[PDB]
Design a protein around this motif. Structure first.
Motif, PDB file in Angstrom:
ATOM      1  N   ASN A 248       0.978  -1.282  -0.047  1.00  0.00           N
ATOM      2  CA  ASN A 248       0.011  -0.074   0.143  1.00  0.00           C
ATOM      3  C   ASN A 248       0.821   1.334  -0.034  1.00  0.00           C
ATOM      4  OD1 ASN A 248       1.007   0.135   2.764  1.00  0.00           O
ATOM      5  ND2 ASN A 248      -0.936  -0.429   3.406  1.00  0.00           N
ATOM      6  N   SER A 250       1.510   3.393   1.970  1.00  0.00           N
ATOM      7  CA  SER A 250       2.197   4.006   3.098  1.00  0.00           C
ATOM      8  C   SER A 250       3.747   3.436   3.105  1.00  0.00           C
ATOM      9  CB  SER A 250       1.562   3.478   4.428  1.00  0.00           C
ATOM     10  OG  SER A 250       1.402   2.044   4.449  1.00  0.00           O
ATOM     11  N   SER A 251       3.905   1.952   2.625  1.00  0.00           N
ATOM     12  CA  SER A 251       4.746   1.325   2.909  1.00  0.00           C
ATOM     13  C   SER A 251       5.455   0.844   1.512  1.00  0.00           C
ATOM     14  CB  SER A 251       4.679  -0.044   3.740  1.00  0.00           C
ATOM     15  OG  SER A 251       3.333  -0.862   2.895  1.00  0.00           O
TER      16      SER A 251
HETATM   17  C1  LIG Z   1      -0.589  -0.703   4.961  1.00  0.00           C
HETATM   18  O1  LIG Z   1       0.802  -1.279   5.013  1.00  0.00           O
HETATM   19  C2  LIG Z   1       1.241  -1.208   6.241  1.00  0.00           C
HETATM   20  C3  LIG Z   1       2.517  -2.076   6.319  1.00  0.00           C
HETATM   21  O2  LIG Z   1       2.740  -2.956   5.411  1.00  0.00           O
HETATM   22  C4  LIG Z   1       0.180  -2.139   7.193  1.00  0.00           C
HETATM   23  O3  LIG Z   1       0.676  -2.124   8.540  1.00  0.00           O
HETATM   24  C5  LIG Z   1      -1.126  -1.542   7.241  1.00  0.00           C
HETATM   25  O4  LIG Z   1      -2.094  -2.435   7.882  1.00  0.00           O
HETATM   26  C6  LIG Z   1      -1.685  -1.512   5.685  1.00  0.00           C
HETATM   27  N1  LIG Z   1      -2.964  -1.046   5.749  1.00  0.00           N
HETATM   28  C7  LIG Z   1      -3.288   0.334   6.164  1.00  0.00           C
HETATM   29  C8  LIG Z   1      -4.755   0.472   5.861  1.00  0.00           C
HETATM   30  O5  LIG Z   1      -2.493   0.954   6.547  1.00  0.00           O
END
Ligand SMILES: *[C@@H]1O[C@H](CO)[C@@H](O)[C@H](O)[C@H]1NC(C)=O
Ligand SMILES: *[C@@H]1O[C@H](CO)[C@@H](O[C@@H]2O[C@H](CO)[C@@H](O[C@@H]3O[C@H](CO)[C@@H](O)[C@H](O[C@H]4O[C@H](CO)[C@@H](O)[C@H](O)[C@@H]4O[C@H]4O[C@H](CO)[C@@H](O)[C@H](O)[C@@H]4O)[C@@H]3O)[C@H](O)[C@H]2NC(C)=O)[C@H](O)[C@H]1NC(C)=O
Ligand SMILES: *[C@@H]1O[C@H](CO)[C@@H](O)[C@H](O)[C@H]1NC(C)=O
Ligand SMILES: *[C@@H]1O[C@H](CO)[C@@H](O)[C@H](O)[C@H]1NC(C)=O
Lengths: 388, 109, 124
Positions: A248, A250-251
């Motif tokens: 996603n 974020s990562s």
């Molecule tokens: C997004 O990615 C992070 C790291 O892989 C994870 O902790 C998280 O649950 C994911 N989903 C959201 C909605 O942040």
């Protein structure tokens, strides 16, 4: 007739407006529509055509059963007008389960790959006649762009991949002049896996945003120089990776020298192109499945590595509606080279265990320098009313 | 070169100097610029690429920027070790090759 | 990697200058290999590059008197400049362009690795 040079500058893009739709699956419930997969759009200097890889059967047929296999002897390259559904009057221009069709301003060129997976033939048909042919050099599922090729000054360039779909594979750029392969250059650069490139002309050469099926969730870029046959490659510097499966927003990451090794164990055909330092790109809404489709511009996503500043986001297909292979084709305007993209909406097996077939529709958007609105243009075909 | 640079660019230690490459449309204007440091007597060494990025090892005191059809290399700190020639290379499009037009020698008094 | 140049220090006018660049570490099968020349008291000038795939490019300003070849068996590559003139004397470096995009707002670390150079003089 004259050879296309694409010497016009790429005009400003502020978004994408709908340009065409197929409704093939909806018409298949009552009509006789081909079962198709992996389509694309290519435009001759007067008008745009849509191509697909038909399974050699119609949707309301007994042979549409188990049409999920990507390579069968009966698959053929269907070609017709952009907008006309793949009916029984469609012209099957060649035999192929992996094709690349594109017009050089004088005649169509079709690269069609057929035969056995280990021993495959790539036939180069120009002006309606078979002009050349090559065989598999790695003897492991020879394939091609699955989209349109690009011809600069009559020198068309195609990207042919041969090798494992989950490991190192030999990718060669074939320079073809009037159907005759004049040059072949193996892929060179930072791209460790190039497959199903979405090529577009970027004068004086070609730029292809391909798919990394081995380790990268970030799409490699391959620049092809049609003058001296030099091939260079890197990855997308934007941190918003456009290849699913992925991680996603974020990562996710992309430093555009090596694959990011973030859920790169698969891929989907996609597209991207550069507007100055920004990058216009399209990707599915879901991070794991091919469900939904957005297109957006990442600011400084072409030059600045790991750029996550997106803008002008459009939802081509909503999250709950299936999507598939997407690609880019260039249309010559009055004074510019507009960029348009197509999205394939796949329906059937194995995601939908109600029907036994696996067909698709296409939705085509084009870039506009004006304003636009929102909306979603999915398949719209109810699987309960479709024949089993 | 086709690229044009000042013959020399000087600055006092501790301060900063900007070296300018001027290019055409099929030049720095449309492509990136790489800045190479050539110590007197040795081979040129990459300092800046893609107008912003730095190779692993190049100090952060070297920075780059591009303004339209021109490029600028900024050297903060400016110790006596930086006295060297600086060349700007851009991938030309009208000749399908590389153009340097170097010659800028940096002196630190 | 380490690129080592080797050539005749003195070349007679109108003769042919044959330079050689030997490559260590990585083999010459994955990148483009360029020759650059720096006249004394002047800036660098690009000669051309060649890859083992057959992709070659030369400077048009040289008027097509340049020829470059690769030898993967020896892991070396050579320059074959023809009909040298008094203005052809320079320090000749051999460098590597590992690929990377050359169009648009994104470039790459081209000429990341150079060679110490060889001073080719043209006189009698
Ligand atoms: C997004 O990615 C992070 C790291 O892989 C994870 O902790 C998280 O649950 C994911 N989903 C959201 C909605 O942040
Ligand atoms: C991948 O594709 C390439 C390209 O298509 C294949 O290359 C071709 O392979 C075929 C098959 O081997 C080959 O054709 C043979 O040529 C031989 C001479 O070069 C012929 O002697 C041979 O005829 C015999 O074999 C046939 C079966 O293959 C029989 O049907 C035929 O009757 C002959 O058999 C009689 O004669 C032999 C010898 O006297 C005797 O032992 C028998 O008992 C019988 O009496 C074929 O015609 C082509 O020449 C190849 N072409 C090229 C360009 O390479 C390649 O094989 C494929 N590889 C894979 C793994 O699929
Ligand atoms: C469809 O194909 C499958 C496998 O090829 C077969 O088992 C089945 O009998 C066929 N027909 C139907 C109606 O599923
Ligand atoms: C196309 O190729 C011809 C040679 O056949 C050349 O004369 C012409 O200049 C080329 N046009 C381009 C590169 O735009």
């Amino acid at each position: 007739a004259e050879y296309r040079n694409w010497s016009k500058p790429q005009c400003n893009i502020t978004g994408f407006a709908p340009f065409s739709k197929d409704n093939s699956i909806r018409l298949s419930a009552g009509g006789d529509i081909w079962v198709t997969r992996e389509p694309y759009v290519s435009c001759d200097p007067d008008k745009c055509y849509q191509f697909a890889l038909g399974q050699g059967t119609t949707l309301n047929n007994g042979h549409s059963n188990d049409t999920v296999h990507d390579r069968t002897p009966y698959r053929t390259l269907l070609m017709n007008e952009l907008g006309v559904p793949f009916h029984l009057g469609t012209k099957q221009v060649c035999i192929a389960w992996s094709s690349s069709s594109c017009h050089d301003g004088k005649a169509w060129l079709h690269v069609c790959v057929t035969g056995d997976d280990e021993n495959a033939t790539a036939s180069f048909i120009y002006n309606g006649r078979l002009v050349d042919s090559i065989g598999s050099w790695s003897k492991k599922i020879l394939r091609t762009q699955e989209s349109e090729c690009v011809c600069i000054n009559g020198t068309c360039t195609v990207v042919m991949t041969d090798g494992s779909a989950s490991g190192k594979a030999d990718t060669k750029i074939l320079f073809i002049e009037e159907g005759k392969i004049v040059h072949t250059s193996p892929l060179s650069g930072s791209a460790q896996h190039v497959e199903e490139c979405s090529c577009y002309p970027r004068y004086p050469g070609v730029r292809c945003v391909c798919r990394d099926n081995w380790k990268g969730s970030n799409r490699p870029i391959v620049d092809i120089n049609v003058k001296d046959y030099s091939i260079v490659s890197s990855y997308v510097c934007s941190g918003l990776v456009g290849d699913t499966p992925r991680k996603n927003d974020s990562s996710s990451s992309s430093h555009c020298l090596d694959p990011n090794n973030e859920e790169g164990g698969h891929g989907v055909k996609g597209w991207a192109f550069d507007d100055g330092n920004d990058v216009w790109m399209g990707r599915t809404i879901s991070e794991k499945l091919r469900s939904g489709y957005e297109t957006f511009k990442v600011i400084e996503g072409w030059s600045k590595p790991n750029s996550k500043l997106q803008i002008n986001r459009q939802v081509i297909v909503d999250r709950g509606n299936r999507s598939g292979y997407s690609g880019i084709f260039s249309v010559e305007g009055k004074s510019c080279i507009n960029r348009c993209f197509y999205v394939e909406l796949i329906r059937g097996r194995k995601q939908e265990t109600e029907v036994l077939w696996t067909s698709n529709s296409i939705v085509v958007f084009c870039g506009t320098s004006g304003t636009y609105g929102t909306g979603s243009w999915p398949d719209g075909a109810d699987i309960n009313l479709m024949p089993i | 070169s086709v690229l044009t640079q000042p013959p020399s660019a000087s600055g006092t230690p501790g301060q900063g100097v900007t070296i300018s490459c001027s290019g055409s449309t099929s030049n720095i204007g449309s492509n990136t610029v790489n800045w190479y440091q050539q110590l007197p007597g040795t081979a040129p060494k990459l300092l800046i690429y893609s107008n912003d990025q730095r190779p692993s090892g190049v100090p952060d005191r070297f920075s780059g920027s591009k303004s339209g059809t021109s490029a600028s290399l900024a050297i903060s700190g400016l110790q006596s070790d930086d006295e060297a020639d600086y060349h700007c290379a851009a991938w030309d499009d009208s000749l399908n090759g590389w153009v340097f037009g170097g010659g800028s020698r940096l002196t630190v008094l | 990697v380490q690129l080592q140049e080797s050539g005749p220090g003195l070349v007679k006018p109108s003769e042919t200058l044959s330079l050689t660049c030997a490559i260590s570490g990585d083999s010459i099968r994955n990148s483009y290999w360029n020759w650059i020349r720096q006249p004394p008291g002047r800036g660098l000038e690009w000669i051309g590059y060649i890859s083992n795939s057959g992709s070659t490019n030369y400077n048009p300003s040289l008027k097509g008197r340049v020829s470059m070849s690769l030898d993967t068996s020896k892991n070396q590559f050579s320059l074959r400049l023809n009909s040298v003139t008094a203005a052809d004397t320079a320090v000749y470096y051999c460098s590597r362009d590992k690929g990377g995009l050359r169009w648009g707002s994104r470039g790459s670390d081209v000429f990341d690795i150079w060679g110490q150079g060889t001073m080719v003089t043209v006189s009698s």
